[PDB]
């Protein structure tokens, strides 16, 4: 939902882990990103593992 | 006590009209109304797809023939319509009024079998895939009730459609049935509001999506005291006399003045003549099914040919089904499919159908066949 | 109570196989089980040849649809295969089970309608005697059931068979009740074991023969306290309406333009044309059931044959069948030749069937008619 729960009210709802089951047990499990929304960054160096 | 909305006939003669002004500016179709009247559904027997039973409610409101019925439930359902775009789509049951009695409980139909109602499709457009056939059926410039979109999974709808026999033309009622055996899937009507925020219509869609995009088998034990009820559907048409008193017309005569020839199927699926045979009566059926065919001689002047007769004779799909009470330690809903443990034999198939009543909630099992 | 024996289903696709070592050397057909459960027949309606109802009975094992049931009598019955020979035949109810019940009622079907179902017979083998159509309709290379052999007398069968009704193809039931009427017999299922004392085998028989080779015709009287059932029944088919509104087509006009010409049929049976009459009515009939008929002129132009209407116009053989209780002062059973007085009027016919039932013993009386 993105709630804001630190100014106002309500009940902060946020998913963090895909678990894919079976009928026995899980299959699969997948977590979901973590967003670090930035500004301007001053780096030296970048290692890549997917794409910009 | 469910909650119901009665809104009238859902006229394809008004809402297929693309007069509605959207916000942005653009010209789209008409969207739903609002409920005439929200009543309280009470006293039912609510299928999930309509595969063997028509739904019989009482309803709180006077409901009159032709009104759309949407039974609302508290829970959300979710359907993958791509193989990652998993969407938010809320539980519902839509069916059209058949018949109102004294006592006001109305004959509910799905809303897709009465909106597929009457409509024929010759063998030319049987030829593709079921796409095709899908594409053609859900058509709001055809059929008697408003359609405004479809979900469906591509995968279990990718493959070549069935061969239609006497390639003749057939109703949508028949091949659907056929392609929904083969494909084991059943559809469910659900009114939900438009994606885009923008648009503010309520549209009603066909769903033929599940919540895996690529299906998964299930292994489980049904018990008889799921008050278990077992009865033998057909899938295919194949006749039902296995011995055959074969009759060949004399050239000379113009008449049958020559004596039959007898034709018996073995246990493996192959037609000898009933001379022929030198065995022990193990590799013959245990009950003898006779009929006594008459047939012409061709321009050729030969006799009919032993596989033309063997056609005649061959077996019909003998299939199982299993209707039980829903198991709350693995549940098992619409559209998944299921390998069934029933008194020590096993049966393997899809559920069907799923009846919500006020003191159950029972399971349609079809066993697919295609064992050896 | 009565006795019965029950087998699994006389399947011809196991029995009919010439591979059972006799004493002596040679090869013979595999003879019939012995019974999976002896049981006792309780609650009956039993018929002896299966003429006009179906049998009954709820029997103490739980017998399954298929299985052969043999009721056993402490009697026995001397039929006469030849003119001198006689064979003691012990006495026999044997039935195929036709469905059973939750209370566990089995529908039991006469062993001998229940063999020749489901076959079909076309004109050209009614075209010979009597003995060639028996020959055909008993045999186990195409019979739905088993059978090794069957004792027929010659006299009653020697005669040629009757004319088939347009020369169709007609089923092994209507053809077999066809010629039934007219020789005025029944059949009756027996198991019995083998004549020779060197064969061990069990056997199933058809029997076609009777008390008495030559049949002599008894004259009896039938009293009101016999608890009498009177209906009519018809041997030949023949239309029901009496009068004929016949309508000739115009040449000139290609229609019906032309006024229709009336055609009434007499008391002794002559057809007329309506206006030609010149009587008091006492030679017409009663009452007049009326018919119009359309009809196209030939290539010669010339309009229709009066005997050609009559066969549309012409009476049915009207049959009386009487079913009443046992006289232990004068016996009748099955295949008897017989003059019944009741009321004051002589019909005469034959013993049909025979129903045994825990409280009596009835018999069906069938008139074979050609009484003037």
């Given at each position: ?8 009210s309500?009940?902060?709802?946020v998913?963090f882990d895909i ?9 699969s499990?997948?977590?979901?990103v973590?967003?670090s929304?930035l500004?301007?960054?001053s ?6 593992s997917?794409?910009? | ?6 809104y009238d006939n859902?006229?394809?003669?008004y809402?297929?009209i693309?007069?509605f002004?959207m916000?942005?500016?653009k010209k ?7 409920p005439?009247?929200?009543?309280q559904v009470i ?6 797809t ?8 009482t309803?709180?409101?006077?409901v009159?023939?032709?009104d759309?019925?949407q ?8 359907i ?8 938010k789509?809320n539980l519902?049951?839509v069916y ?6 004294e006592?006001?409980k109305?004959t509910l ?10 409509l024929?499709?010759?063998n030319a457009?049987?030829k593709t895939?079921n796409?095709?056939?899908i594409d053609?059926?859900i058509?709001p410039?055809?059929?008697?009730l408003?359609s405004?979109?479809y979900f469906?999974?591509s ?13 003749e033309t057939?109703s949508?009622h ?7 055996s083969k494909?084991?899937f059943?559809?469910?009507t659900?009114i939900?509001h438009?994606?885009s925020?923008?648009?503010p ?5 066909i ?5 895996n995009?690529?299906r998964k088998?299930?292994?489980?034990r049904?018990?008889?005291k799921?008050?278990?009820t077992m009865?033998?559907?057909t899938?295919?048409d194949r ?5 055959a008193v074969?009759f060949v017309k004399?050239?000379?005569?113009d008449?049958?003045t020559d004596?039959?020839?007898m034709?018996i ?9 009933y001379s022929?045979y030198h065995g ?6 245990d009950?003898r099914?006779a009929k006594?065919?008459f047939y012409?001689r061709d ?8 596989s033309?007769i063997?056609?005649?004779i ?5 299939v199982?089904r299993?209707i039980?009470?829903?198991?709350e ?6 559209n998944?499919l299921?390998?069934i443990?029933?008194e020590?034999?096993?049966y393997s198939?899809?559920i ?5 009543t006020?003191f159950?909630d ?5 066993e ?5």
């Amino acid at each position: 939902n993105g709630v804001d729960i630190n100014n106002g009210s309500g009940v902060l709802k946020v998913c963090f882990d895909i678990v894919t089951t079976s009928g026995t047990g899980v299959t699969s499990t997948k977590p979901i990103v973590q967003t670090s929304t930035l500004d301007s960054i001053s780096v030296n160096d970048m290692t890549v593992s997917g794409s910009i | 006590m469910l909650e119901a909305n009665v809104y009238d006939n859902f006229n394809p003669n008004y809402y297929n009209i693309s007069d509605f002004s959207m916000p942005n500016g653009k010209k789209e179709k008409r969207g739903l109304p609002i409920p005439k009247a929200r009543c309280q559904v009470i006293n039912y027997e609510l299928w999930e797809t309509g595969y063997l039973y028509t739904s019989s409610a009482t309803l709180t409101v006077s409901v009159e023939v032709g009104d759309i019925v949407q039974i609302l439930f508290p829970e959300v359902v979710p359907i993958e319509e791509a193989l990652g775009k998993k969407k938010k789509l809320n539980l519902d049951m839509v069916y059209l009024v058949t018949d109102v009695d004294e006592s006001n409980k109305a004959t509910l139909k799905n809303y897709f079998w009465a909106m597929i109602e009457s409509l024929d499709v010759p063998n030319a457009i049987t030829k593709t895939t079921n796409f095709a056939i899908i594409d053609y059926l859900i058509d709001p410039n055809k059929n008697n009730l408003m359609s405004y979109g479809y979900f469906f999974n591509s995968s279990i709808f990718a493959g070549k459609a069935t061969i239609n026999r006497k390639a003749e033309t057939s109703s949508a009622h028949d091949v659907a049935k056929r392609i929904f055996s083969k494909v084991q899937f059943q559809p469910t009507t659900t009114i939900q509001h438009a994606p885009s925020e923008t648009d503010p219509r309520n549209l009603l869609f066909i769903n033929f999506a599940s919540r895996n995009w690529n299906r998964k088998r299930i292994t489980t034990r049904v018990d008889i005291k799921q008050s278990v009820t077992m009865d033998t559907e057909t899938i295919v048409d194949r006749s039902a006399y296995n011995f055959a008193v074969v009759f060949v017309k004399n050239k000379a005569t113009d008449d049958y003045t020559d004596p039959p020839k007898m034709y018996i199927a073995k246990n493996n699926g192959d037609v000898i003549d009933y001379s022929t045979y030198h065995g022990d009566g193990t590799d013959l059926p245990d009950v003898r099914t006779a009929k006594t065919l008459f047939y012409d001689r061709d321009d050729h002047g030969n006799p009919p040919e032993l596989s033309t007769i063997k056609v005649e004779i061959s077996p019909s799909t003998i299939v199982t089904r299993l209707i039980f009470n829903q198991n709350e330690l693995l549940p098992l809903y619409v559209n998944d499919l299921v390998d069934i443990w029933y008194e020590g034999k096993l049966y393997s198939g899809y559920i069907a159908d799923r009846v919500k009543t006020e003191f159950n909630d029972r399971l349609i099992f079809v066993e697919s066949g295609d064992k050896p």
